[PDB]
Amino acid sequence: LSLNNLQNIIYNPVIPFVGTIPDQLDPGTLIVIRGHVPSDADRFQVDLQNGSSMKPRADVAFHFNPRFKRAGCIVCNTLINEKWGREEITYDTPFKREKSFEIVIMVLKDKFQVAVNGKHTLLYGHRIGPEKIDTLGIYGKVNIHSIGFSFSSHMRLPFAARLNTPMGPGRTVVVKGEVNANAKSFNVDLLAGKSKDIALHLNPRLNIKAFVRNSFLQESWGEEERNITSFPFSPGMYFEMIIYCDVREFKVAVNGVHSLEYKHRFKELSSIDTLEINGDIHLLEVRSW
Ligand SMILES: OC[C@H]1O[C@@H](O[C@H]2[C@H](O)[C@@H](O)[C@H](O)O[C@@H]2CO)[C@H](O)[C@@H](O)[C@H]1O
Numbered sequence: 001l002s003l004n005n006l007q008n009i010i011y012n013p014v015i016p017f018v019g020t021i022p023d024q025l026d027p028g029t030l031i032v033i034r035g036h037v038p039s040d041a042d043r044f045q046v047d048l049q050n051g052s053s054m055k056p057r058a059d060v061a062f063h064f065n066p067r068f069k070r071a072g073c074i075v076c077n078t079l080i081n082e083k084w085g086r087e088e089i090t091y092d093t094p095f096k097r098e099k100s101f102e103i104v105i106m107v108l109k110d111k112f113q114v115a116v117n118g119k120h121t122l123l124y125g126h127r128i129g130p131e132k133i134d135t136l137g138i139y140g141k142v143n144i145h146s147i148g149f150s151f152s153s154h155m156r157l158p159f160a161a162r163l164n165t166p167m168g169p170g171r172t173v174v175v176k177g178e179v180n181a182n183a184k185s186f187n188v189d190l191l192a193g194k195s196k197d198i199a200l201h202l203n204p205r206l207n208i209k210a211f212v213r214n215s216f217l218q219e220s221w222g223e224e225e226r227n228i229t230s231f232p233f234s235p236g237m238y239f240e241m242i243i244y245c246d247v248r249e250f251k252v253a254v255n256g257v258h259s260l261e262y263k264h265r266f267k268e269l270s271s272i273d274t275l276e277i278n279g280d281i282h283l284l285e286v287r288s289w
């Protein structure tokens with residue numbers, strides 16, 4: 001989505017910019033580009049290239065070229081052995097002079113998918129294998145504020161985020177990831193933003209094989225409850241954890257099977273507006289419904 005999903009982000013590169021992509025463009029990979037088009041813009045381009053050689057000019061797997069004229073458009077093409085391929089023009093350009101934009105390039109198995117300002121713009125079939133793309137170039141009249149990446153790898157820690165919709169009965173938070181091969185423990189916290197206290201602290205401890213959960217209220221930890229019919233976590237084990245909010249307590253499940261219930265100690269459910277995750281895991285995805 002916004003920032004907890006990026007593993008790498010660069011601000012204000014000078015144009016022309018030619019930089020190495022920090023990881024492979026694997027399917028599901030997201031490249032987010034934010035900037036604005038100057039008032040005198042005639043054209044600019046985002047090129048995903050194999051290398052950065054200028055002689056011979058490095059192959060351009062995917063040339064994204066917004067052009068500004070009476071019938072604004074985006075010209076896409078591929079360059080092989082210094083020669084251009086079949087030109088693909090998308091008209092009704094989303095881009096406009098003196099306006100800012102957000103470009104989201106999603107890497108797919110067989111093509112690139114591109115959305116601008118949250119609206120689908122075009123698809124581009126792979127002409128060069130994306131494994132071969134290792135550098136991103138930006139040229140022309142365009143100002144880039146930031147570029148960011150979200151590889152299919154894991155997310156970076158710590159993970160801190162506000163939850164779009166307030167916490168309340170029926171509200172769900174699902175977390176997916178993998179416990180590190182040599183994990184000790186990790187935690188998943190639901191906090192009251194301002195208060196800065198913790199409504200629900202889920203802390204699985206692998207070294208002690210126990211699931212500690214507690215509440216942090218009034219600048220202090222409460223009475224811990226570890227009772228459980230079966231430790232759901234194992235070092236190196238993939239998992240999905242669903243935290244369901246009910247009227248009387250939280251219901252927590254792991255890999256499709258219920259683990260435990262935690263009666264509410266922080267009664268103002270609607271005030272629980274922050275999710276925090278940390279510890280010995282590879283966080284793969286966080287979803288609050
Ligand atoms: O095809 C991408 C490539 O287009 C070049 O311009 C084209 C132009 O669109 C067309 O009208 C003309 O007949 O041929 C030119 C060369 O193929 C751009 O110069 C180049 O930078 C890419 O944008």
Ligand SMILES: OC[C@H]1O[C@@H](O[C@H]2[C@H](O)[C@@H](O)[C@H](O)O[C@@H]2CO)[C@H](O)[C@@H](O)[C@H]1O
Nearest residue numbers: 187201203212213214215221222223224
């Ligand atoms: O209540 C959860 C809270 O536990 C803290 O650790 C405790 C530990 O559980 C207890 O056995 C020991 O005697 O004292 C420790 C004091 O911290 C964690 O440090 C904290 O992060 C929470 O997980």
